[PDB]
Amino acid sequence: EKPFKCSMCDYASVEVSKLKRHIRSHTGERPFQCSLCSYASRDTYKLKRHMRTHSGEKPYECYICHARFTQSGTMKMHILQKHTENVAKFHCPHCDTVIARKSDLGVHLRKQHSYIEQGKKCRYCDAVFHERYALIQHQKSHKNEKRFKCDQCDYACRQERHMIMHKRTHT
Template sequence: FTSLRISSLNRHMKTHSDEKPHVCHLCLKAFRTATLLRNHVNAHTGTRPYKCSDCDMAFVTSGELARHRRYKHTLEKPFKCSICKYSSVEASKLKRHIRSHTGERPYACYLCSYASKDTYKLKRHMITHSGEKPYECYVCQARFTQSGTMKIHILQKHGENVPKYQCPHCNTFIARKSDLGVHLRNLHSYMAVAIKCSYCEAVFHERYALTQHKKTHKNEKRFRCDQCSYACKQ
């Protein structure tokens, strides 16, 4: 890495360090730089300081704004493949594309010989080992390892009952637009006064995030005997 500015070099050098001195006062997550912390806190508070000059959209980070403008307005694809005519809005997508030329599969499963070009496909593959089925059909409650398999099931088995509206923030499907509005207000609207988790010190400004967080405490044995090693859930 080389740079014309010492500030850029200093920022780059932090990527080689494990030091994370900037701590979020809301969730205690730590970051390498003040900029990363500021972007993170903006996500907590719902602050979107980066406004698009071509439409009414606003974003938490400058990177999100730049990506939005390329996708929606300028249609610029600055990241170009040196081997073929492929070009991309994002550097990460170009990097993944180049692996289709090189055959590189850097993300390997530690349980079998499978390897992937990207982390998403590896994560999806790992579910086949765990037996986990995180995707549930909202009509018959059948469970699936992959969201694509679940969607095919819904179309084939319950096509006539498929609701029109899907929540943009979670996997909930809702039949009526008015009910979607209620769902968004109740679960996904920003709350100025944060709600504290009843099991730990974490706080949230969105009810859905709190609900999902509480699931991580589901199997905890929080009540311990002070005379022996016995512990129980309730």
């Protein structure tokens, strides 16, 4: 198994150097200071990855369109979202919107489905909401009131006689 177990959490690794990193995450030690700005890193490669920002080095080139990127994960996501079909996307568990990247789903969850302690009143009635999505859905539902729907086309109407005359435009 993993003999080098951590004392402050439930982490364990088969290498003592890996436990040195994890224990360094608890203490917050940063034994690698950047010689340019005030940034300090816990790992060696993280500092070298930071030096790309000062030197402008972009060692990852999309083999399709030949754009360059600083980190490899950036290039992978680029290729996945720009040059690839049938990519699995994320569905929000609270609404129907589909979001491509996982981090953008988290931004959606915090902006649309977080509880707002200070309620906001609907701009059309006295209804008050503590969630942005419920508030927006309610205000958009005010447009549906006193509006006759559409069977085939996308035409909306407010008068029963005008919609009954619009139905005759199909026959």
